[PDB]
Amino acid sequence: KVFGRCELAAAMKRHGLDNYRGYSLGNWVCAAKFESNFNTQATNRNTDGSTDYGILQINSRWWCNDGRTPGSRNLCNIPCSALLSSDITASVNCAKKIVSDGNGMNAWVAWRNRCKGTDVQAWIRGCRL
Template identity: 50%
Template sequence: MRSILIISLLSCFFAAHNAKVFSKCELAHKLKAQGMDGFHGYNLANWVCMAQYESDFNTQVVNKKNANGSSDYGLFQLNNKWWCKDNKYPSANACNIMCSKFLDDDINDDIRCIKRVVRDPNRMSAWKAWVSHCKNKDLSQYLAGCNL
């Protein structure tokens, strides 16, 4: 019993260790370094706004409440029906990656995938939170004070 408790506590520690919650400016700098400013016509503020409303900048968020039974993973809430594979739901896996890779603090693979998503016909409208909260809005607040 004691060893199960120790293993459980260690598992929680390692899971928390891999979690990352970005600040808006930290994320903006990372996205800029990865060429996202102006990528397919979307400036950094669009990406930062979308991430805030999708995950509140938290890499460990998993949304399992989609009406079709699919789930969304990570900072950019990438869906297991279209973009990644989780062995729980049939997937097109267009980003050719396991969904669990979107839950760690290394967002380079997440960025590669969002570049793939935005090349599709839906572009940024693939993210409902972006449509509801960011599209055609003044997004200057998302980069304010970031010294970009």
């Protein structure tokens, strides 16, 4: 699924991501934009042989099992394929674990490089939430 901006904003809020670990909804929508362009089916191979899955590009190195990331972990206890679903429940659940790991949303390098410190509220502008 390619979510609309406000569509994804509404979904993230429903699943309790708005102000989770103190990160406003605009922060999460911005990370999704630059990680996946709001595409649930987005997959990207990392230089280390791990892969990034779904709207928030969750890495197989730590968080989900894809069977081809040697010496990895599955801390969200889910197949990475679950993270490509049109239903973002699994992605959100797992993102909550990631953002709680101690570096907040810096875990998403695209959030650090493209969202952090910016006017993230723009991403929820015009949305009925």
